[PDB]
Amino acid sequence: ALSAQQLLNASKIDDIDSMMGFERYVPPQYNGRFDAKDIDQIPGRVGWLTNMHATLVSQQGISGVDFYFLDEEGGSFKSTVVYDPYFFIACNDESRVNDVEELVKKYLESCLKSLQIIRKEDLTMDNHLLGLQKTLIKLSFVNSNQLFEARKLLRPILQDIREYDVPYHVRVSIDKDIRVGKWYKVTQQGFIEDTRKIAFADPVVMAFAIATTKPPLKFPDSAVDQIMMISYMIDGEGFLITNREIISEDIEDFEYTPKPEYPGFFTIFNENDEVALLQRFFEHIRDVRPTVISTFNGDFFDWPFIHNRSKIHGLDMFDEIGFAPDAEGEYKSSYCSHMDCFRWVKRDSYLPQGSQGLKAVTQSKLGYNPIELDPELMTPYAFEKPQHLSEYSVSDAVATYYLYMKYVHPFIFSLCTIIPLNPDETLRKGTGTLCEMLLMVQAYQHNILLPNKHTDPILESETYVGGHVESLEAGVFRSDLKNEFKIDPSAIDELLQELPEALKFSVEVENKSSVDKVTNFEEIKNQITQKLLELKENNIRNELPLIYHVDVASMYPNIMTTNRLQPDSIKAERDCASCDFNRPGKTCARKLKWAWRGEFVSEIVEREAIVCQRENPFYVDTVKSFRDRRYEFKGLAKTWKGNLSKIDPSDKHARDEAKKMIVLYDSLQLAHKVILNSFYGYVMRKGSRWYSMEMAGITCLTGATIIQMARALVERVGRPLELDTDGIWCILPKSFPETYFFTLENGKKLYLSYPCSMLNYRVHQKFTNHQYQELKDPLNYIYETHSENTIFFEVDGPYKAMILPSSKEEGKGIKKRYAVFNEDGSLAELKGFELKRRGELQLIKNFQSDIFKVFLEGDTLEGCYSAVASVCNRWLDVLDSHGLMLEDEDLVSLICENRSMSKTLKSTSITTARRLGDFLGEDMVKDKGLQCKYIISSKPFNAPVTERAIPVAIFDIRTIIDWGYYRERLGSAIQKIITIPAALQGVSNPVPRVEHPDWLKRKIAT
Amino acid sequence: TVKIWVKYNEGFSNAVRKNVTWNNLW
Amino acid sequence: PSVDIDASQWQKLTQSREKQTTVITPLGMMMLEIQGELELPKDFASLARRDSPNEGRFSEQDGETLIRFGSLQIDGERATLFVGKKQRLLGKVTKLDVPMGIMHFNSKDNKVELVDVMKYKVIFKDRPLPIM
Amino acid sequence: SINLHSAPEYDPSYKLIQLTPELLDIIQDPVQNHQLRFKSLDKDKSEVVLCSHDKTWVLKQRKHSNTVLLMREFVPEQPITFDETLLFGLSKPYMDVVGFAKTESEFETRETHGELNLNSVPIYNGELDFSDKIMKRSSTKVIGTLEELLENSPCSALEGISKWHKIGGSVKDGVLCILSQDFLFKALHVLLMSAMAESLDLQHLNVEDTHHAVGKDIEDEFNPYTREIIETVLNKFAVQENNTWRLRIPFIAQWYGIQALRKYVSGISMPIDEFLIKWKSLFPPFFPCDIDIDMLRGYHFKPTDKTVQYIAKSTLPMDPKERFKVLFRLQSQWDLEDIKPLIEELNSRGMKIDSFIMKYARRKRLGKKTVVTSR
Ligand code: SF4
How many CA atoms lie within 13 A of A301 on its CB side? Predict the structure, then answer.
């Protein structure tokens, strides 16, 4: 009934699809032996899988799934697999399973497609550890609609649910063991992976950029505004289509090649109007048949614009190219991915939100600065500078094309080869759901029954501490300035005691070797002995430091794998009732500390929970193995690096696949890296199927204890400056034993950083789980115990300089704001600062961008503060002279303030926005991204802070500006970056208008 | 005699290569 | 259409002088490139008359009003440019990888003569500061 | 310091041209007089090229966003004193220079193959008294000399003469023309028949002896094989250096093979064996040459592996998919090395031929052959 409507849409999509080159291929019958090794004999067609979709087929329709393949020769076909949807009902009284069976048999007179008896593991159930399984009624349906009828039958009961959001395509891809990006021969027996083909085929790739009209100071609205140009690229060749009703001259053919690597020969299509550009666009697309189309925010701007003008021009986008809005309003086809780069930008690029514009991503990833043009000048230029507009357009298109190809393409395409989703879905689903689905894959393959999703609304609040952060010191520390160390000699004594085993451990556990083949064991050990004894004698010392950062490698996953931690291991009112407790020794159950934090008002209560060392291991083996596969790729990577250098430089020697391979394995190991660290965050996600607040507590407390041991050692042998969650910045004495290198007997060398190994040795002495068990023989349920610990600190440095800020408040630092400098003197990270925050004074940005690099000049503290005093005095001159010593043009640019409203108009951001709303209409401020251009005015005097911003761009500036306000805000910044660390280090105020407050002098010794 | 100055371009962009006609020159 | 390249004058001057070594050729020529827009008056004849000799910023030279619009001080590779009373630019002398050529298209007669070759350039890539 | 002056108005005639080292060296050669030339086919549409005596560059203008001021030295007529303002790091002026030009773009030069504009040049089929026929048509363009032709063509002098030799350019009865393929090769065959009739040294041919050999026993008025015709055949099928000719025997035989294809096996696909027999017998007696189909690879096609039929590459479409479509209609199965010279001119990027195909058409191999199967 409703089947047949899905069949009508399916048949329309089929017509579109066949029009685009995916005819249904049905491989030949083969009654013979399904074998994967003689794959080439079996009748069928070999293909690289690039897409797959659920479908409905007529004899009401039958549900199944279409898989889309690319052949080895650049061609295409589609083929379809059918599969029955099903879900299970669990019963609480086994004795009446037959009664439940009979009940539903009657209750589900016609909705049901089939049923069958299976057994699954229940981790809450007594004697599950001896192999007792849970018995279920599997309820199957012809399609999701029937599933939905069952859920509606069940909803009043729940008022008085299982497998309800598992995507159909995911269930088939998993059960059939299918992944996009892999190679298959499609045969009657099913899909046979061709393990001989690993290298991807080459999809059809489209990149495009549009240029549109818009009204002054408002946003484009697709009901009335028009497209003025459409530029595009197909596999690195550019095209530009022009609407000569608006663009006032014919663009001629030209070349734009911004780097030799990136040739761009552009062909021009001067079309008379909008509908013609659309039809040429659709027509060219049909000509070339792309399977990826990429955009940046095309889902919210480009595409609806296309839809509304198409409707306005009587065009049917689905009929033209098979795109239509989905339930989210996004435009999707079966055959062609919509790669809106912005989602990847926001989720995966690892950039602050202040840098999520196309410009900053271009700069970061492609490394040069394309031409930029104000839209307000773009419309006049249609008449006045059409060539300039065209130069801008192609710069846009080149950046977007190569941006996708160099970063998004390897990453997304490589990740798709292990996750059973198309690229689009991997872009859009939550990372929590991503984690959930991977674990579901792993669970299904191990016959593990899925937990239902948690659904209760958030303990109304749950904002517990996840990681521990402390700001310990602020100031500049530099390798050419000497520092005082007060060494605790008893730390050195402990270290000397640990030294034979710590260094032996370093060789054999940290380095996976054997002392037997090491040449210089005793030499190294004497050298260290001498350095520690020297430090022990002269333990109050003043000399040049080594500025180090030490950071544990993959802290929480390693905590998980070492302790075999997962949510299902939490007792949950019972353990040892059915499986034997005594023979491990702690009665089987291992108690571990966590720090619980509730919000109900906040209170911490220490709690402890028991982790059975024998529970079924399903989460952790996947993570360990995944860690090993990444390590595998690091190895493979290195082998490829050797291949990448052995060979000749004649790039046309059929090794551009090898460089792609190199890139590929790089991509694969980092894709595995991101998947690895997301396994921790899943356990705190809302609606998690594997919810454990306890697990989060255990992770934070364990990491806090390891890192507190490390800070307490460095604090006894050097000076830690700042600690955030997993990193420690410290200074060590130059006489402190540092890096050495053991030589192996084969001549190979093993790297040794002695501070990292001394800490890792202590972590392994104190935090090893000696109770780690593992099924050695599952039939008899005998566990074997051993010692596991894969937690290792690594060290970076020593560095050229380090600068840490302080708060304006007493005894308080500022977290998630710091400056760090590389050995070469360059800036490594800027976190948290006003530069990153939305809405900041450009003058302040220009200030900070000037000041940071100037702290590396000079040999002393006073000279550096004098040089920064001088740049401050330049800035004091611009603001104290109210800009008079300055040309009139440079002034207006610097003072503008722009602010986003986090809500709707219905703060300083609010008042400017409100006034823009009132003046240009509430529609201006009903939406986000309103350009609020404002200054904080001197006037009205005596008015409150929320009234202080009145928009003035909307309207003498030197008397309107609250110059004292802007110099005070910059002063605040000057305080945080320059004067207050100077103040806490006892240097008298090099920027005198910001005075040392009393608290910091008192705070410090003086 | 005091209103002569330079409006600074923040960076450098090099435009698209273009064909040349005789009329582009003449 | 078609026309030969005239390079005789440049060649004769070139042969008697050494190859270009520094930023200025033995014939005394130079180029200039600025990362920015030169904000100039819309008129020129009128402002040269209010120019005083002490200032000498808008001089009159051979009946043509030349403006002394700034100063360039060349120190080795380093160069600094002060413009007017309110602008200061810090820069460098860079040697051209490809010696460019300036020439002269006599549009009147459609004749082309090679004028000169340049091997160095004086660039100012940083935002101007006041001369103080 | 240097005192900086600016003219109020720059001459836009001064423009910047990229001078590569080779261009500079050529430029710094006082020996050359008119060896460098700006050239263009027309004034409003065609590209303008830069040609040396033997090389050609295509011009590309490239705009930049900076202010570039060209200056040169001037002697200020009257002493002027500078306002010293808050100028630090600023010394006494020791030169005055004035900016006389302001250029906004650079002209990039890329080496390219010069080509002839063969717009108004007619085809000659061997008609007697052709001067009358050139006035029977309305061809306003007159080509007295090749230099005039070359001057209004986008190519270098040497490139022009080479192409002229390549296309078999001539002049008949005082009117420049291009011989039809049929009449050119027929005149060639008769010429070679005279060449074997007069026992000339094929490695040291000159114009006079050969012209005399052709027109020995025929009246000059009815002898179209003039000396200019002789010079054309020598410049087409032989190589000069006085300057004497030596025959490119495998090349001539290849031409002859193409001609044979056009006369006898164009409308029908003969098996290769019989056509080679007749072909072999078609030569003037005792001509030393053997044969292989690879010598005519790119000039014929094979419906099956053992048959041949003529195809002209010129007749193939410019667009790859169209060209492949008609190529596959002509021959279901192509050899990769056989199909490359028919598409070589479309092979602009120079890469692997299979990747070039994979944008439009797709490949499918067999044992020794690698074929392409468009859908
Ligand atoms: S603690 Fe051990 S004995 Fe007890 S239930 Fe857990 S695994 Fe079994």
Answer: 17
Nearest-Cα distance to chain B for A264, in Å, is: 9
List A483's β-bridge partners, or say none: A543
Residue D144 belongs to domain spanning? 123-244
Q: Which residues of C touch B4 (CB under 8 A)?
A: 39-41, 57, 67, 69-70, 83-84
Distance of CA A562 to the CA centre of its chain: 25
**D180 and D100 in a common domain:** no
B15 in contact with chain D, both atoms CB, cutoff 8 A: yes
d(CA D313, CA D343): 8
Beta-strand pair D96-111/D2-6: parallel
Helices (H) and strands (E) in chain A, counts: 30, 37
Beta-strand pair A331-332/A475-478: unpaired
What is the SS3 string spanning A429-481?
A: CCHHHHHHHHHHHHHHHCCECCCCCCCCCCCCCCCCCCCCEEECCCEEEECCC
Choose the final residue of a domain: D77, D111, D145. Answer: D111
Resolution of the coordinates in A?
A: 5.8
Shortest CA distance to A547 belongs to which of A604, A497, A493, A473?
A473
Concatenated DSSP letters for B1-26?
----EEEE-SS--EEEEEE--HHHH-
Question: How many separate domains does chain C show?
Answer: 1
Tokens representing D261 are 């294809």
Chain A closest CA to B22's CA: distance in Å?
15
Alpha-carbon torsion angle A944, A945, A951, A955, nearest 10:
40
User: Rounded CA gap, A753 and A750, in Å?
Assistant: 10
- Domain membership of residue D297 (yes or no) is yes
Among D211, D244, D277, residue at a domain's last position = D244
The 3-state DSSP class for residue A370 equals coil
CB burial of residue A286 (10 Å; 0-12, 13-18, 19+): middle
Alpha carbon C83 to chain centroid, angstroms: 14
- The domain total for chain D is 3
The residue type found at A764 is H
**Could you tell me which of D289, D301, D286, D288 has the C-alpha nearest to residue D338?**
D301
> Which pair of tokens denotes residue C57?
């910023």
Q: Does residue D364 share a domain with residue D260? A: yes
Candidates A890, A891, A892, A894, partner chain C, best to mutate (most C CBs within 10 A): A890
Only one residue has tokens 């298109």, namely: A397
Two tokens, residue A467: 């990681």
Residue D117 forms part of a structural domain = no
Supply the range of the domain harboring residue C98.
1-132
Question: Burial, A748: exposed, middle or buried (Cβ in 10 Å; 0-12, 13-18, 19+)?
Answer: exposed
Of A123, A126, A614, A616, the one to substitute when testing ligand 1's pocket (max ligand atoms within 8 A of C-beta) is A614
Any residues with CB less than 8 A from the CB of A932 and at least 6 apart, and which? A897, A898, A899, A901, A909, A912, A913, A916, A951
- Which residue bears the tokens 């109050």? A540
Taking a contact as any Cβ pair under 8 Å apart, which residues of chain C between 34 and 63 contact chain D? 34-38, 44, 53-57, 59-62
Q: How far is D108 from chain B (nearest CA, A)?
A: 8
Q: Which two tokens stand for residue A693?
A: 């607040």
Q: Integer distance in angstroms from the first to the last C-alpha of chain C?
A: 55
Give D247's strand partners: D238
Q: What is the experimental method?
A: cryo-EM
Query: What ranges in A656-812 are assigned the alpha helix state H?
Result: 656-681, 693-717, 754-766
Domains recognised in chain A with CATH numbers: 3-83+177-193 (no CATH), 86-175 (no CATH), 205-425 (3.30.420.10), 461-614+690-798 (3.90.1600.10), 838-1003 (1.10.132.60)
Task: Name residues contacting ligand 1 (CB within 6 A).
Answer: A 129, 575-576, 579-581, 588-589, 612, 614-615
